[PDB]
Amino acid sequence: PMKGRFPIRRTLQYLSQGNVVFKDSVKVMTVNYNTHGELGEGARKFVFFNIPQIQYKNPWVQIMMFKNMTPSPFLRFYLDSGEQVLVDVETKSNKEIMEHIRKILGKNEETLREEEEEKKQLSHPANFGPRKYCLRECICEVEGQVPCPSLVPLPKEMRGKY
Amino acid sequence: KPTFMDEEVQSILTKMTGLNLQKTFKPAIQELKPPTYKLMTQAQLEEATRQAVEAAKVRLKMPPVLEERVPINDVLAEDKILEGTETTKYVFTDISYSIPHRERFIVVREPSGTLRKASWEERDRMIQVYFPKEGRKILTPIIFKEENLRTMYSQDRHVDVLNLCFAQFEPDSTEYIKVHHKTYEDIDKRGKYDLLRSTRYFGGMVWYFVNNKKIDGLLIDQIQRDLIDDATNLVQLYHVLH
Amino acid sequence: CRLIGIKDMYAKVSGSINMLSLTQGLFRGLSRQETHQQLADKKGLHVVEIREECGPLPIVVASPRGPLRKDPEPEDEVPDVKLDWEDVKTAQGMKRSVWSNLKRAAT
Amino acid sequence: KDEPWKYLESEEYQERYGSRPVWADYRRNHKGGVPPQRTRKTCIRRNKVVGNPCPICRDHKLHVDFRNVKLLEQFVCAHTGIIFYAPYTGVCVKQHKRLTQAIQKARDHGLLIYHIPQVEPRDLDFSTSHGAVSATPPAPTLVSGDPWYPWYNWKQPPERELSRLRRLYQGHLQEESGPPPESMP
Amino acid sequence: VRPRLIAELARRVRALREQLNRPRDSQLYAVDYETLTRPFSGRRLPVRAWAD
Amino acid sequence: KAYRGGHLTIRLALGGCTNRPFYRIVAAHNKCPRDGRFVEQLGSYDPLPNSHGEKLVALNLDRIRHWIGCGAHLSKPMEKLLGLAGFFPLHPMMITNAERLRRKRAREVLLASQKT
Amino acid sequence: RSSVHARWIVGKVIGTKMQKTAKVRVTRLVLDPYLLKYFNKRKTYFAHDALQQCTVGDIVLLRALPVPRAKHVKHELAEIVFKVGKVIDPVTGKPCAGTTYLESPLS
Amino acid sequence: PKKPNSANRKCCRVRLSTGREAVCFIPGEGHTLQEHQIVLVEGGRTQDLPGVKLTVVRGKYDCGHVQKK
Amino acid sequence: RKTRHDPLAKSKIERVNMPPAVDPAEFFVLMERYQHYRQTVRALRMEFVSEVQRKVHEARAGVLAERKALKDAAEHR
RNA sequence: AUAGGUUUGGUCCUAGCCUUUCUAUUAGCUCUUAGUAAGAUUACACAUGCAAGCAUCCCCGUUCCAGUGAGUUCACCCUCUAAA
Ligand SMILES: [Mg+2]
Ligand SMILES: [Mg+2]
Ligand SMILES: [Zn+2]
Ligand SMILES: [Zn+2]
Numbered sequence A: 001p002m003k004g005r006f007p008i009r010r011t012l013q014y015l016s017q018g019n020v021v022f023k024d025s026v027k028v029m030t031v032n033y034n035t036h037g038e039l040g041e042g043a044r045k046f047v048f049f050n051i052p053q054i055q056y057k058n059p060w061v062q063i064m065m066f067k068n069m070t071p072s073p074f075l076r077f078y079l080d081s082g083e084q085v086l087v088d089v090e091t092k093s094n095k096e097i098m099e100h101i102r103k104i105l106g107k108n109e110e111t112l113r114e115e116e117e118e119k120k121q122l123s124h125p126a127n128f129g130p131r132k133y134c135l136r137e138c139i140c141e142v143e144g145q146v147p148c149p150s151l152v153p154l155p156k157e158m159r160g161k162y
Numbered sequence B: 001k002p003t004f005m006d007e008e009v010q011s012i013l014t015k016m017t018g019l020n021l022q023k024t025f026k027p028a029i030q031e032l033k034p035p036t037y038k039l040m041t042q043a044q045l046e047e048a049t050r051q052a053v054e055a056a057k058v059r060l061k062m063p064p065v066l067e068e069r070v071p072i073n074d075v076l077a078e079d080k081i082l083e084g085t086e087t088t089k090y091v092f093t094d095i096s097y098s099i100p101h102r103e104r105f106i107v108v109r110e111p112s113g114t115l116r117k118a119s120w121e122e123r124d125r126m127i128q129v130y131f132p133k134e135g136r137k138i139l140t141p142i143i144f145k146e147e148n149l150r151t152m153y154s155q156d157r158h159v160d161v162l163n164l165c166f167a168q169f170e171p172d173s174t175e176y177i178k179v180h181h182k183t184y185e186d187i188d189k190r191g192k193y194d195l196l197r198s199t200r201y202f203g204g205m206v207w208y209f210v211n212n213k214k215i216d217g218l219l220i221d222q223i224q225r226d227l228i229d230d231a232t233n234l235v236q237l238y239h240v241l242h
Numbered sequence C: 001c002r003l004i005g006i007k008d009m010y011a012k013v014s015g016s017i018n019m020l021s022l023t024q025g026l027f028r029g030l031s032r033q034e035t036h037q038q039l040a041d042k043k044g045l046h047v048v049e050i051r052e053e054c055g056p057l058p059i060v061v062a063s064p065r066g067p068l069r070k071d072p073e074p075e076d077e078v079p080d081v082k083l084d085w086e087d088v089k090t091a092q093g094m095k096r097s098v099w100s101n102l103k104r105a106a107t
Numbered sequence D: 001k002d003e004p005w006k007y008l009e010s011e012e013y014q015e016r017y018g019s020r021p022v023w024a025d026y027r028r029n030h031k032g033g034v035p036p037q038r039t040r041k042t043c044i045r046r047n048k049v050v051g052n053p054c055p056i057c058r059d060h061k062l063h064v065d066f067r068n069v070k071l072l073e074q075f076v077c078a079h080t081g082i083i084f085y086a087p088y089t090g091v092c093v094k095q096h097k098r099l100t101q102a103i104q105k106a107r108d109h110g111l112l113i114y115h116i117p118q119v120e121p122r123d124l125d126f127s128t129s130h131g132a133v134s135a136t137p138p139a140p141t142l143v144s145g146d147p148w149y150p151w152y153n154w155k156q157p158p159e160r161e162l163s164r165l166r167r168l169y170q171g172h173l174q175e176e177s178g179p180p181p182e183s184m185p
Numbered sequence E: 001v002r003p004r005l006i007a008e009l010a011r012r013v014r015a016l017r018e019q020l021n022r023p024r025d026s027q028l029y030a031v032d033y034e035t036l037t038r039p040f041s042g043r044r045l046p047v048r049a050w051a052d
Numbered sequence F: 001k002a003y004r005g006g007h008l009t010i011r012l013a014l015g016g017c018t019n020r021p022f023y024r025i026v027a028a029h030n031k032c033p034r035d036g037r038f039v040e041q042l043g044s045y046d047p048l049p050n051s052h053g054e055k056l057v058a059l060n061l062d063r064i065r066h067w068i069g070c071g072a073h074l075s076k077p078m079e080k081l082l083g084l085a086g087f088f089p090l091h092p093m094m095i096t097n098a099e100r101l102r103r104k105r106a107r108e109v110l111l112a113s114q115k116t
Numbered sequence G: 001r002s003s004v005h006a007r008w009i010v011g012k013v014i015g016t017k018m019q020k021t022a023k024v025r026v027t028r029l030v031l032d033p034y035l036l037k038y039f040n041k042r043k044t045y046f047a048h049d050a051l052q053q054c055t056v057g058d059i060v061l062l063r064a065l066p067v068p069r070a071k072h073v074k075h076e077l078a079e080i081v082f083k084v085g086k087v088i089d090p091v092t093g094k095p096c097a098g099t100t101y102l103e104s105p106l107s
Numbered sequence H: 001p002k003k004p005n006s007a008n009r010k011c012c013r014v015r016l017s018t019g020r021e022a023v024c025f026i027p028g029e030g031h032t033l034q035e036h037q038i039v040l041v042e043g044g045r046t047q048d049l050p051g052v053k054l055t056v057v058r059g060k061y062d063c064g065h066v067q068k069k
Numbered sequence I: 001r002k003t004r005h006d007p008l009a010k011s012k013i014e015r016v017n018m019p020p021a022v023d024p025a026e027f028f029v030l031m032e033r034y035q036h037y038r039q040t041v042r043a044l045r046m047e048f049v050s051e052v053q054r055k056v057h058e059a060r061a062g063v064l065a066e067r068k069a070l071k072d073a074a075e076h077r
Numbered sequence J: 001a002u003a004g005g006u007u008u009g010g011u012c013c014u015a016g017c018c019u020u021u022c023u024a025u026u027a028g029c030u031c032u033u034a035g036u037a038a039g040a041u042u043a044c045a046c047a048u049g050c051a052a053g054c055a056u057c058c059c060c061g062u063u064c065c066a067g068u069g070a071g072u073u074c075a076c077c078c079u080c081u082a083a084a
Helices: A041-050 A053-058 A095-104 A109-120 B008-016 B042-059 B120-129 B146-154 B158-166 B175-187 B206-211 B216-224 B228-241 C019-031 C036-043 C085-092 D012-015 D069-075 D093-109 D142-143 D160-168 E005-020 F061-072 F076-085 F090-114 I026-061 I061-077
Strands: A028-030 A062-064 G008-013 G025-033 G038-046 G060-064 H012-015 H020-026
Touching: A028 G008, A041 A095, A053 G025, A062 G008, A062 G025, B008 B206, B008 B228, B146 B175, B158 B175, B175 B206, B206 B228, B216 B228, D069 D093, D160 I026, F061 I026, F076 F090, F090 I026
Parallel strands: A028 A062
Antiparallel strands: G008 G025, G008 G060, G025 G038, H012 H020
């Protein structure tokens, strides 16, 4: 047994199960919900489960978690200029509110794909570096010069042996 | 209308090649890690089979065959200063990123003051030494030597043969075309069109046999087996191309 | 395993160490299980095994002998599953150890 | 045995193994507990085999090479392309090198079968005639003789700067002759 | 943070000395009319300077 | 503590082991070490050629050209490499070395005609 | 613009024993490299209330100033977005109590 | 040493040049040592021997092989 | 090696700095070709400045980025 | 860590020391062919060979590499900018 009725939050796979990513200009993601009422079960389960995913996707955003505020909370967001986006949370499912927040603060999948393509283009393994951010230090290790003369011996072709 | 890289013609030629879901995606000897025993329904199984068939068809999109070539010794920028003094082939190229190896500029020099652009074989060897890929060995493969080729053709096993032939040379090399022609000629003798149904095959088999009129064995095998629609399609293709 | 016929399987003998106790535990475990045909007859769906060596080509092991549902098993959010933390740690490679699966009395 | 290829084809192999492997069927009497991460070095020694012979050297006539594919199949997994190195089995370093060489020869000749999951090629163009490795219109100076920058080839310079240099550097007497040839014996 | 005041003061004093003691091109640069050398430095002269 | 990032001064250092000659370009200032405070650290250079004589060189001039435009000096190795590469004309030092080789061959012909 | 790192940040007002200023704290989540859980972590900050609107007990946004004009102060409290206790609903949200609609809305 | 294995061990105090000073035990039938001796000391630990942590090695600047009758 | 302020040994600071070998015609060819190469290198440095300008233009003034930003703003609206 | 040894007349849970082996530095012992990386461990102290030249004197490397672990969240970012 595990220490948690919902141990999905501690299973590794949940970390990689992320997907949504906020914009590069977000600042604070103030969100309030209710826990005692049984009306907004969807939004409750959403805020309870699908949150560490977005947090691990980018832990550069502020979080606000309240207990009991009002039967009709909200989801106050913030943009570059620190605007105030208003929207209700009551009477909302989980995937619905997830898609809503992804469309509002989250970035479109096209932008993420473009960023991934740009990062791949930035990758240039053809370069040579003595073991750190690249592979094959010098041309000696790879099919070229003598494979590390400091270890493998050499015949009379070299100097100082005649 | 030859059109070697056509659409409908190549699609029909691939259709003539037996799909065989069990042969194309045969359980290879790879890192057989314990997979997941998911429970799929009828619709999901049908969709997965369709995806596998599409992947196998995409696997039959290569290679091209356009005869052999000749290693040309280019002579561009001549400098009457060296004339046989500085050798070792100096290469000063800028490796960008998204550029095919055929469009690179491997400025290979010569002992004289000329300016070569890397011979075909030398260019291929340098490309292989640079960025390898699925297999692809530097020098010629020992698997396709004289005695090795004879042993491979005598034991009847043209799956790994074509697999390595595609994953070793380039789609326009001398030894490549030679080995492919030898394998096709060996396949022609005695009907056995079946082993070539799990790898690159349409390189220069049906195309070459239709250009040189060698569809006798294939027609005999088709008549002995079955498939009347395929026979009519082949007759129509022969009437059109010829 | 040799007397049973198994040829390859790992076992983490954690907790206590005893012969009769281990045999009784193994018997209890093998008594409360469901075979492939039994699992297929229970759930109904086909027991497909996506072989990693092959492409997207499914291969069914035990086919159904009665029920045939059109809708597959759903993949809802946060599936309730309890697993061991040491297994995930060893899979990720958190701790260090040159004695887990290196050179032991294998085969 | 001289010209072997007969042990496996005889009844000795059936009476010995027949279906079990040869590398796993071994009991090392070293420091009990678990086999070591490094095994014995040279199988033979001088003229006798000191201690328990190698799991491979115990067999007198069977060799290690592509000719004996049964040994390679037994040493390699029945469904994986992983080679069980010597530290895992328990074989002399000589036999380990022999097995490595035999496996290399077999893989270079085309013995061990294996399906390669191929993908797209390295280039999109397929024609030995692209302009990147064909030719290029030469330059007018190059056609006339000396390429661009006419100061590349030798040119008899004036005498004023020669007198200047002779006036400067004098202790290092180094007189030349004339325009040297361009050949090379 | 505590800035190394001893080292800073030492370096500042050295720099102030080197600046205020700025010698013109005559004190230590006094060229000799025989030995063909310069005081302070004490280095040699090029072969051309044997008589220039 | 204060950098400079002004004019560059490419300095070399053939550091390595015996029977192993390998270049090592290091771009920095004139008043800076090699492994100390620098401006840009670029990859090394391949002196001797690889197998079957194929001296491959990776032209990493992308940022070097920008630094030159912003102010960057060169040394003898970088100058000779740029000259014998392709962008700059053939370095005059190497052309004159070829001329000296021609003179040496002429002297060898003279010696062969004189001696025997 | 804001020379400091944080630009916009929300926090509660607590410490106000000063002139034209109000200490504000920010609550953030920190992940453990073993427990795999986001734990709540608070950090006190110094704002700048140019006029002191409310006393204490209010969660309001902050605007980072260009350059700190003292020592550690960096934020500027110039707008109370909401009032603790009298939380406002999205639409037709009147100052009501907690879980008790004392102020009849839709009026 | 102990009650059951009533032997005649020669426990002598050995001061280390580093600084520490404790008791040690020299193995081998017959203690041929005396007092003034600069011999190497290894970290050998004997099984049944209370108050023993190190031993004397007759190798470093002493003897080569082992005593054989 | 030495470091300015050193006791400096005595087995080298007592010899004149002799100049290298200089052949009149060969050295004059050296210098003529070196002047030509230096002029060409200065021209190529000016061309490198121009190319850096062109690259900065293609990067910043690239209408593609501005159009993408405008489309993103419209999508946000 | 998949074995466990070590209590009690014996067993279970339960917890202390330890190998079985990879090893980096080494005591003795024995001590082939050909070739390489190291011969300051101690922020101990130092003979002899020395190690900074030079371009027409202007002048730079000398704040370079070369060694040590005294100290030891300077060894990386956001808002951006100092000579050049
Ligand atoms: Mg007892
Ligand atoms: Mg320290
Ligand atoms: Zn052996
Ligand atoms: Zn090196």
